[PDB]
Design a protein around this ligand. Sequence first.
Ligand SMILES: [Zn+2]
Length: 118
Amino acid sequence: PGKATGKGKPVNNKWLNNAGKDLGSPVPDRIANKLRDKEFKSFDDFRKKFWEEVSKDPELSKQFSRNNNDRMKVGKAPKTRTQDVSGKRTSFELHEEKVYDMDNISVVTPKRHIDIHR
DNA sequence: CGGGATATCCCG
DNA sequence: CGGGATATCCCG
Ligand SMILES: [Zn+2]
């Protein structure tokens, strides 16, 4: 349990184009402002709220296919391009930098997330 | 032999 | 409009 805070880094129309590099993409600032100070019971809820926010933000929603926006409307993470999957983890994941500190959270591809941790 | 993740199941 | 309980991913 905890409240989200942070809010940072502006985003463009190639938001997740590089999710597979380095630390990935950051929490869009537009999204962070929508989630800041909100109350979440588990990180899973946050993740569920986060993806819903991405589906209601027009500038971001258009960077995804019809299928992916449907996923995000109900809180599921959008699928990554096939080249970025890792076994059965096939959707963008949220990485933490070592829990609702949105400036410490970033979006990365399964494949890239694996390497970062090892 | 533990740590970091997403997703579904289902609410009398 | 939620979220607890539970399943299952993938790492050496
Ligand atoms: Zn991570």
